[PDB]
Amino acid sequence: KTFKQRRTFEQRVEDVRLIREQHPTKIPVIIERYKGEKQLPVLDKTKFLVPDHVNMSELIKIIRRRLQLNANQAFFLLVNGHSMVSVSTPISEVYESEKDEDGFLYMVYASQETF
Ligand SMILES: CC(=O)Nc1ccc(CN2CCOCC2)cc1
Ligand SMILES: [Cl-]
């Protein structure tokens, strides 16, 4: 059901390697809705190629636009399983410290802080 359950470790490693070859300036990001989530919709896809210069604040704005949220819908985003310490960090720096061993950066979103 989740991305890690659908694709083998070997398969995830090879897809990150192909994104390095074909989209060298992009961060490979997995974005999934929290399994408990009621309010927010699901995304149109799972795997996202994020320009490596954007910061976490801008990525949140990007995901809010993709979900077509309105101003008063709450949105919380975990990176590698935990809260972001700072939204100002360039995603290239976030990737180097928070990437999975498969080479993806994993994110989860919910309408509540308590996931
Ligand atoms: C596109 C891409 O990133 N490819 C890739 C392929 C293999 C590795 C693993 N290497 C093998 C040779 O040296 C030891 C570690 C890393 C990256
Ligand atoms: Cl690129």
Curated annotation (Swiss-Prot):
Phenotype when changing residue 48 to A: Decreases C18 ceramide binding
KW Membrane (keyword) present: yes
Topology with respect to the bilayer: Lipid-anchor
InterPro entries linked to this entry: Atg8-like (IPR004241), Ubiquitin-like_domsf (IPR029071)
Pfam families documented for this protein: ATG8 (PF02991)
Function: Ubiquitin-like modifier involved in formation of autophagosomal vacuoles (autophagosomes). Plays a role in mitophagy which contributes to regulate mitochondrial quantity and quality by eliminating the mitochondria to a basal level to fulfill cellular energy requirements and preventing excess ROS production.
Protein name in the entry: Microtubule-associated protein 1 light chain 3 beta
Species of origin: Homo sapiens
